[PDB]
Structures are given as structure tokens and as C-alpha cells.
Design a protein around this ligand. Structure first.
Ligand SMILES: *[C@@H]1O[C@H](CO)[C@@H](O[C@@H]2O[C@H](CO)[C@@H](O)[C@H](O)[C@H]2NC(C)=O)[C@H](O)[C@H]1NC(C)=O
Ligand SMILES: *[C@@H]1O[C@H](CO)[C@@H](O[C@@H]2O[C@H](CO)[C@@H](O)[C@H](O)[C@H]2NC(C)=O)[C@H](O)[C@H]1NC(C)=O
Ligand code: NAG
Ligand code: NAG
Ligand code: NAG
Ligand code: NAG
Ligand code: NAG
Lengths: 292, 211
């Protein structure tokens, strides 16, 4: 190596700088913060009573952390299709707010909850715009929402003067006028009641049994920091040249127990000439020095 | 009337510990020896942050209200404190033009479309600022017309609202049985850090040739 550095075959006595020694770092520890305020998905999926189709319950989710690994890994889920976003990477792209609509429709009508569909459900009760971005889910609930003798509390509407617009709701109960003679709000001939409650029973066939539905839909208008998915904070090692990532602070070096005392709102410390030389561990809240 | 701050309205520009290091910053500060209004109440402007001190052993100052119109048709913030504890809130309101047993709260008459909730002598300083949809609040409580001294203000809150602000007010507890307002401008300061990491002194670098 000396002969190569000098470009010769005879080196005379001396002392020669030949190269450099640089310790090597192994593994990459990515630190971060908890989840804390998270998405209370345990309510929109587990309420004891779900709404009806003509009047669907819309619950919004504020700024939290969303753990979709609870819904993806949980249950049979007879249908699960996500349209704008790929179902797997739901943890790296986040949006301003999510909404979770819910209802109870029939089995053979689940295929109507999709962008660009037609039918008694997609034209009169719940219409999804063609520019959908969320992701639909639906599962069977025959053992809960079905009583022997008929369950007459679910009330899809089947008559309306015009097709619904995307994401509208109509709970009016006026009498539909079919003919040309007004009926002044009473049933009779050519005037009908526009609600046609399902006759749910346990001894039905698949395609006529109740199927609960949840429709997550995402929106990102202009908010810079919003609800987002969860990340990670690998265990923290010490006394080894490591590649570390403190809730944003990316660096390399040896980590060591400190004996300085930050003020209880300061995250990391800097030197003169402005280099990060101490951090605080988010989870345990202890100060650690960073030496190269 | 009007009064003169002396060296007031210094806050820690951010996290990151620090010790003896005359560190230099550019930010929005309240210039030294400024012209601060005196109040013994009306709609004020905001325009770029606000310094706000007060004094009273009882608690007459019971929070502020912010926004552009202080009514419906646009959103606003509301920060309140009954004898219980603080209540931050963000809806569209309908605010009394003069909003203010022990029964109270003639403040608003509407709470629509709420997009954020939260529930739970003396000198009490506050610095309010609003950058990139975040509404930052620094504060300090030092106990004994203002006096003369140095005391740096530590960050309290952070709210990712998005709200626009152009005006603000105050809230007071009536009688049935003193406060100042500075404004902040882009200045350059030189902060002296202690060995524990606290700001003990400062220099406003636009005062006199010495600075
Ligand atoms: C939906 O709610 C039910 C009841 O509230 C949950 O059933 C509970 O499951 C846990 C875990 O096995 C048990 O310890 C409880 O005893 C169960 N509750 C009852 C009343 O027996 C169910 O886990 C919830 N489902 C989801 C997805 O959260
Ligand atoms: C983030 O979560 C961790 C655990 O996942 C919390 O660590 C706990 O800290 C308390 C100290 O008050 C210990 O008594 C617990 O034993 C810790 N738990 C574990 C599993 O180690 C940590 O406190 C959380 N962050 C915050 C800010 O509270
Ligand atoms: C503050 O400005 C007003 C504006 O007219 C002026 O009258 C007053 O003297 C000023 N106060 C000081 C302390 O300079
Ligand atoms: C204090 O005011 C808040 C404002 O809504 C209210 O929620 C709370 O109940 C009040 N305290 C008591 C004891 O009522
Ligand atoms: C805000 O409230 C008004 C009146 O209550 C309502 O018309 C409007 O839809 C609300 N905003 C949203 C986004 O729903
Ligand atoms: C605040 O008001 C200005 C008026 O010039 C407007 O252009 C701006 O869009 C408003 N802020 C937001 C976040 O919309
Ligand atoms: C804080 O600073 C004082 C004086 O600068 C020093 O005596 C003390 O040890 C420091 N630490 C404390 C009070 O925890």
C-alpha cells in the first residue's frame, strides 16, 4: 500500500500516510414517538345497532393515529376492496380526515357500493362518486341482525323523483306521486310509501342475509400535519457505532448515558458550531450523548 | 394610556437544550423599550403575534377569543377558564359584541360545526403566534403598570388548526356580588444561555450603536 501510494517500487526511509481507518456501523435503529391518541375504530365497527340505508350514520375521525392492522388482520370480511390506495401501504400515506359511513344492506347488493354503479341502492340511497379515494369493506352479520319472525327496522328506500348526487342524504318521507292526480299525502292508487323495510330472517339464503358495511373515505385538502399511520421505535442500543433515527433526527454515532439536564420541553442539544450532540429518548425521556 | 416595556417578551425560539452560548436568532420579537397600550374590553388587531401581560390576585382575565370575524360564517378559536379549568374550543360561534350564584358565560350564543374541542400579586405573560396552521402559545407566571426585569417565556401549547386570524379580544369576570398589548416584529436578538440552559439576558441588536 505504501508502494502504491508513492507510485514506486523502492520506498526510502520515512513515514508515509497510506490510508484511513473508519469503524463500521451495523443495523439502523429508527426511534419515534408512541401512538397515544389513536383512531377509536372499536366503535364504528362494533356498535350494537347499525343504522339504516336511507339514513346512514357518518362519523368523522379527528387528528389521531390510525392502526389499520387491527381491521386488516381480524376477521373473515366477505368483501374487502380498496380503490384509490393500495391496501397494504395504508401506513405511509395519510390525509386530513377520514369518514366511516355505515349501514345494513342485503347480500346481493354489496356489489353496488362502488364508483360507477346503478341499482336501487346506488341511485336512490347511497351514491359513491366516480373519483373515490377511500376503501370499502363489508362482512356478514346473519347471527346478530336477524330475528326469527322478521326484523322490520331496516328500511331501504326504493322511490325517488331523481337520482341522488354523490354523497347526499335524503330522509324525507313524502308520498311518491306516480300518476298525474295529486294525493295530498295519503296512500291509495298511484301513490306509494317510499320505504320498503327488509324482512330479515335467519333461514334465508346467502345474498338475502344482512351484510353490514363500512366505507372509509380519505380527504387531503390543504392540512400540513394531520392524522397519520403508525411508525416504529426499535430498541435503543448503547456503546456501539449505530445508525439512529430519533423522531426525525437522523444520525450516526455511539450513544451513551448522559448526566446533563435539559429543560422539560427540550428534545436535543447542540454544540457551538451547531452539531447535535445530545438527544432525549421519547419513550423513557432520558438524555443520551452522541459521540462520533 | 400607554406604557414602556423594558426587556419583556423573550421566549425560547424552540426546543433543543443549550448552555452558556450567546446564540444569535432572527425571529418575531417584541422590541425592547416599546410602546405598549394600557387597558383598565374592545376588539384589537393581531397582524403578527401578540404579547399580553396582566396582574391581579383574583382572576378577572378569563381567556381570550380569536379569529377574523368573531362570529359565524367563518371559524374562530375560543379559550376560556371558568373556576374549574381551561377550555380550548374551535367552532363557528355567535359572539356577543360585548362578551363576558356565581353564574356566568354570556360569551356566545352558538357553537356550530366544532372542529376541535378540549376540556379538563401575580404577573402572567403570554405570547401568541400563528404560523403554518399552527397556533403557538408561550407563557410565564412571575409573581411580585408593569415593572422592570428579565424573564423568558416557555412554550405551552401547539394547535394544528388551520384557522385564519385577524382580530382578538379579552374576557372578564363581572362585578355582581389592568392589561397590556404589544405586537411582534421580525428582529434579531442575541440570547445569553446559562449553564442549566435558561436564557438569563438578551440584546436587541437594533437599539443603539452598542447593540
Ligand atoms: C366487540 O365488542 C365485544 C363486546 O363488547 C368484544 O367481545 C369481547 O372480547 C374480549 C376479547 O376476547 C373479551 O375479553 C370480552 O369478554 C368480550 N366481551 C364480552 C361482552 O364478552 C369484541 O372483541 C369486540 N370486537 C372488536 C373487533 O373490538
Ligand atoms: C410510550 O409508550 C411507552 C411504552 O410503550 C411508555 O413507557 C412507559 O413509561 C412508564 C414511565 O412512566 C413506565 O412505568 C412503563 O413501564 C413504560 N412502559 C414500557 C412498556 O416500558 C412511555 O411512557 C410512553 N410515552 C409517554 C410520553 O408516556
Ligand atoms: C406611543 O404612541 C403614541 C401615538 O400617538 C404616542 O402618543 C405616545 O407618546 C407613545 N408613547 C411612548 C412611550 O412613546
Ligand atoms: C366550565 O366551562 C366549560 C365550557 O363548556 C364547561 O364544559 C364546563 O362544564 C364548565 N364547568 C362546570 C363545572 O360546569
Ligand atoms: C356548518 O354549519 C352550517 C350551519 O349549521 C351548515 O350549513 C354547514 O354544512 C356546516 N359545515 C359543514 C362542513 O358541514
Ligand atoms: C386567509 O385569508 C387569506 C386572505 O387573503 C386567504 O387568501 C387565505 O386562503 C386564508 N387562509 C386559508 C388557510 O385559507
Ligand atoms: C442551575 O443553575 C444554578 C446557577 O447557575 C446552579 O447553581 C445549579 O446547580 C443549576 N442546577 C439546578 C438548580 O438544578
Amino acid at each position: 500500500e505504501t508502494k502504491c501510494t508513492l507510485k514506486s517500487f523502492t520506498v526510502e526511509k520515512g513515514i508515509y500516510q497510506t490510508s484511513n481507518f473508519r469503524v463500521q456501523p451495523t443495523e439502523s435503529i429508527v426511534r419515534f414517538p408512541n401512538i397515544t391518541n389513536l383512531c377509536p375504530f372499536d366503535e364504528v365497527f362494533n356498535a350494537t345497532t347499525f343504522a339504516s340505508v336511507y339514513a346512514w350514520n357518518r362519523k368523522r375521525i379527528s387528528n389521531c393515529v390510525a392502526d389499520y392492522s387491527v381491521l386488516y388482520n381480524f376477521a373473515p370480511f366477505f368483501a374487502f376492496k380498496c380503490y384509490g390506495v393500495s391496501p397494504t401501504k395504508l401506513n405511509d400515506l395519510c390525509f386530513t380526515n377520514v369518514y366511516a359511513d355505515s349501514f345494513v344492506i342485503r347480500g346481493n347488493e354489496v356489489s353496488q357500493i362502488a364508483p360507477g354503479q346503478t341499482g336501487n341502492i346506488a341511485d336512490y340511497n347511497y351514491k359513491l362518486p366516480d373519483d373515490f379515494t377511500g376503501c370499502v369493506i363489508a362482512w356478514n352479520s346473519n347471527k346478530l341482525d336477524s330475528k326469527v319472525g322478521g326484523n322490520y327496522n331496516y328500511r331501504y328506500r326504493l322511490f325517488r323523483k331523481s337520482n341522488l348526487k354523490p354523497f347526499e342524504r335524503d330522509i324525507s318521507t313524502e308520498i311518491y306521486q306516480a300518476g298525474n292526480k295529486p294525493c295530498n299525502g295519503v296512500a291509495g292508487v298511484n301513490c306509494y310509501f317510499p320505504l320498503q323495510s327488509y324482512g330479515f330472517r335467519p333461514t334465508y339464503g346467502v345474498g338475502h342475509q344482512p351484510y353490514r358495511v363500512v366505507v372509509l373515505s380519505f380527504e387531503l385538502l390543504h392540512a400540513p400535519a394531520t392524522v397519520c399511520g403508525p411508525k416504529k421505535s426499535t430498541n435503543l442500543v448503547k456503546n456501539k457505532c449505530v445508525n439512529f433515527n430519533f423522531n426525525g433526527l437522523t444520525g450516526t454515532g455511539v450513544l451513551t448515558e448522559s448526566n446533563k439536564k435539559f429543560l422539560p420541553f427540550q428534545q436535543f442539544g447542540r454544540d457551538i458550531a451547531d452539531t447535535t450532540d445530545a438527544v432525549r429518548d421519547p419513550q423513557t425521556l432520558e438524555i443520551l450523548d452522541i459521540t462520533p | 394610556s400607554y406604557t414602556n416595556s423594558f426587556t419583556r417578551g423573550v421566549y425560547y425560539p424552540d426546543k433543543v437544550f443549550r448552555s452558556s452560548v450567546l446564540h444569535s436568532t432572527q425571529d418575531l420579537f417584541l422590541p425592547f423599550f416599546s410602546n405598549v397600550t394600557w387597558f383598565h374590553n374592545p376588539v384589537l388587531p393581531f397582524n403578527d403575534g401578540v404579547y399580553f401581560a396582566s396582574t391581579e390576585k383574583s382572576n378577572i382575565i378569563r381567556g381570550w377569543i380569536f379569529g377574523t370575524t368573531l362570529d359565524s360564517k367563518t371559524q374562530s378559536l375560543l379559550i376560556v377558564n371558568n373556576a374549574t379549568n381551561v377550555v380550548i374550543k374551535v367552532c363557528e360561534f355567535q359572539f356577543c359584541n360585548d362578551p363576558f350564584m356565581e353564574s356566568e358565560f354570556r360569551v356566545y350564543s352558538s357553537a356550530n360545526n366544532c372542529t376541535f374541542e378540549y376540556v379538563s400579586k401575580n404577573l402572567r405573560e403570554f405570547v401568541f403566534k400563528n404560523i403554518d396552521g399552527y397556533f403557538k402559545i408561550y407563557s410565564k407566571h412571575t409573581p411580585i403598570d408593569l415593572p422592570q426585569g428579565f424573564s423568558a417565556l416557555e412554550p405551552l401549547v401547539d394547535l394544528p388548526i388551520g384557522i385564519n386570524i385577524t382580530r382578538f379580544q379579552t374576557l372578564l369576570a363581572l362585578h355582581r356580588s389592568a392589561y397590556y398589548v404589544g405586537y411582534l416584529q421580525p428582529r434579531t436578538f442575541l440570547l445569553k444561555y446559562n449553564e442549566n440552559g435558561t436564557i438569563t439576558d438578551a440584546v436587541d441588536c437594533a437599539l443603539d450603536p452598542l447593540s
